[PDB]
Amino acid sequence: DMPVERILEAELAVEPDPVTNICQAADKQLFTLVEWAKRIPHFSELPLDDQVILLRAGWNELLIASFSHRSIAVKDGILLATGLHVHRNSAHSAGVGAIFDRVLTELVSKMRDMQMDKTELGCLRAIVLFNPDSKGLSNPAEVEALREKVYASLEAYCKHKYPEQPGRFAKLLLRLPALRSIGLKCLEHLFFFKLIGDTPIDTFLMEMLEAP
Amino acid sequence: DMPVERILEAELAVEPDPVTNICQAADKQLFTLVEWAKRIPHFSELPLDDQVILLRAGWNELLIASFSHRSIAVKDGILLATGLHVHRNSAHSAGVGAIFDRVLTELVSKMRDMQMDKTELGCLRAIVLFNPDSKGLSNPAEVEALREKVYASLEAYCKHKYPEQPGRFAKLLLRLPALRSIGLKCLEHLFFFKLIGDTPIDTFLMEMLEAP
Amino acid sequence: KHKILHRLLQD
Amino acid sequence: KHKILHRLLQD
Ligand SMILES: CC1(C)CCC(C)(C)c2cc(C3(c4ccc(C(=O)[O-])cc4)OCCO3)ccc21
Ligand SMILES: CC1(C)CCC(C)(C)c2cc(C3(c4ccc(C(=O)[O-])cc4)OCCO3)ccc21
């Protein structure tokens, strides 16, 4: 069983140079991400190795969806978990304007325009978490089954909460390819920051950047 | 109006070392891709500059979806548009085994398991084509409207053709993030082949690898 | 720029 | 490997 009420509870439970501040917030949220995942139905029941695989595979997308939704009422910028607001101009002045603008135009603005709610956000993150294509999974079919239960619950929720919007479910799912692309580009940047060594990178963030 | 019958017609209309053979097929299909796009409702009505933007943005994903579906009855390999069958072992022996295996496990096998049909394939490709997040679009709202019409028609088609499978529509859309990731990795490889200069790259393929 | 693509979209 | 992550998932 995959009740949307439980997913919502998981979201509510974890709610609290420019690049250096952004990376600091990322490290901080990685700890919170683990607590979030444990609250998602059936995640803690999967074998430990698979739990590790799913988190290492989706942490970028999971964190991006979270700060993007948290920034829906912010104009031309994002709100970091540390409480700091980062404006588009600041990101541009730091050399990461292109990827920052993609987050604003492809995610933040779209979430705002459709008024994506916390339940929907939680379900999309749960779908991202339960990625059956993650390499190394001991039982990909089990993870696929969990993903299917999540999107079945999400579709039911959308039709009941927003009956006047027949395309809302599809619209929500169609933000996932953009999230995937942005997450990959973000990872590339992080690898570069690590390579250059000019940006402080905390221990957990650093660990996520280590080889499998 | 976006009739699924028209999209199906577009698909049917275009139906006919290891890396060098694969790139040759890619160049060949780029010409066919343009003919395919022209057959998709409303595409040719968009301004020429936008038509160019949409094709330059999605050609990788568009071509990958096509040869993946064409290879559904192939065991551990893909069928190129040139008629040549490429086996997983051959791809591995050429140094591109990892990305080849992703195509097989995340796309080909999944299309086969759910028996994705040509109408569904065509609709997914149409959704990929009408990407409103493509940079430079003169009117992103217009492209978004076209995408919405496609997935509305696809959902209607799925519920009518496969009423016993309530999650089929969602399942179809959820193959898009994987397609996006694989397309990006494919592009990276192509840029490297070009950089190294040890693999013949035809004129159209080469043009798609040029800067915006 | 995009010489081939433009010509082919010409129709 | 993945020292921190394993410890945190320990619960
Ligand atoms: C590469 C760089 C600096 C460019 C701009 C954006 C904002 C996309 C970004 C995002 C991340 C982040 C991240 C940032 C902020 C938060 C937060 O405040 O919750 C959580 C995670 O890390 C992992 C994924 O997303 C890290 C680096 C970058
Ligand atoms: C990088 C390399 C050689 C690795 C393996 C795969 C099969 C993914 C691949 C696919 C492509 C291709 C492509 C290949 C075959 C066909 C075809 O036969 O229709 C059409 C396009 O080009 C653009 C997108 O996909 C190009 C290069 C590679």
The owner of tokens 């140094």 is: B95
Residue A173 sits at the vertex; the CA angle it makes with A46 and D9, to the nearest 5 degrees, is 25
CA distance A31 to A42: 19
Cα B133 from chain centroid (whole Å): 17
Looking at the DSSP bridge assignments, the partners of residue A127 are none
* Ligand 1: centre distance to CA A32 (Å): 14
CA distance B181 to A91: 25
Instruction: List residues in chain D touching A: CB distance below 8 A.
Output: 1-6, 8-9, 11
Q: Determine whether the shortest distance from the Cβ of A103 to ligand 1 is under 6 A.
A: yes
CA distance A98 to A63: 19
Domain locations in chain B as residue ranges? 1-212
Solved by what technique? X-ray
Of A209, A193, A202, A167, which is closest to residue A31 (Cα–Cα)? A202
Contact B123, B47 (CB under 8 A): no
Please report the atom of ligand 1 found closest to the CA of residue A183.
Answer: 24
Nearest to C4 among B48, B51, B204 (CB): B204
According to DSSP, residue A85 is labeled E
**Which two structure tokens, joined as six digits, stand for B113?**
């398991």
CA distance B76 to B89: 9
Residue A77 sits at the vertex; the CA angle it makes with A72 and A82, to the nearest 5 degrees, is 85
* Resolution in angstrom units: 1.9
* Ligand 2: centre distance to CA B108 (Å): 13
Q: Determine whether the shortest distance from the Cβ of B205 to ligand 2 is under 6 A.
A: no
> Helices B176-196 and A176-196 sit at what angle, rounded to 10 degrees?
40
Q: Do A38 and D11 touch (CB under 8 A)?
A: yes
Q: Give me the numbers of helices (H) and strands (E) for chain B, helices first please.
A: 11, 2
**Which two structure tokens, joined as six digits, stand for A17?**
């140079």
Nearest to D9 among A52, A204, A207 (CB): A52
Distances (CA, A) of B121 to A140, B10, B65, B125: 24, 11, 8, 6
Chains A, B: CB contacts within 8 A come to 52
The owner of tokens 């590790």 is: A52
Neighbours of A190 (CB within 10 A): 20
**Which two structure tokens, joined as six digits, stand for A151?**
């999107």
Please state the length of chain A: 212
CA distance A144 to A140: 6
**Which two structure tokens, joined as six digits, stand for B183?**
């397309």
Q: Do B151 and A170 touch (CB under 8 A)?
A: yes
Contact A152, A4 (CB under 8 A): no
Please report the atom of ligand 2 found closest to the CA of residue B80.
Answer: 18
Distances (CA, A) of A166 to A106, A125, A130, A133, A169: 21, 21, 25, 29, 7
CA distance A86 to A99: 14
Residue B1 burial (10 A CB sphere; 0-12, 13-18, 19+):
exposed
- DSSP letters spanning chain B: ---HHHHHHHHHHH---HHHHHHHHHHHHHHHHHHHHHHSTTGGGS-HHHHHHHHHHHHHHHHHHHHHHHTTTSSSEEE-TTS-EEEHHHHHHTT-HHHHHHIIIIIIHHHHHTT--HHHHHHHHHHHHS-TT-TT-S-HHHHHHHHHHHHHHHHHHHHHH-TT-TTHHHHHHTTHHHHHHHHHHHHHHHHHHHHHT-S---HHHHHHTS--
CATH 3.40.50.720 for domain A1-212, yes or no, is no
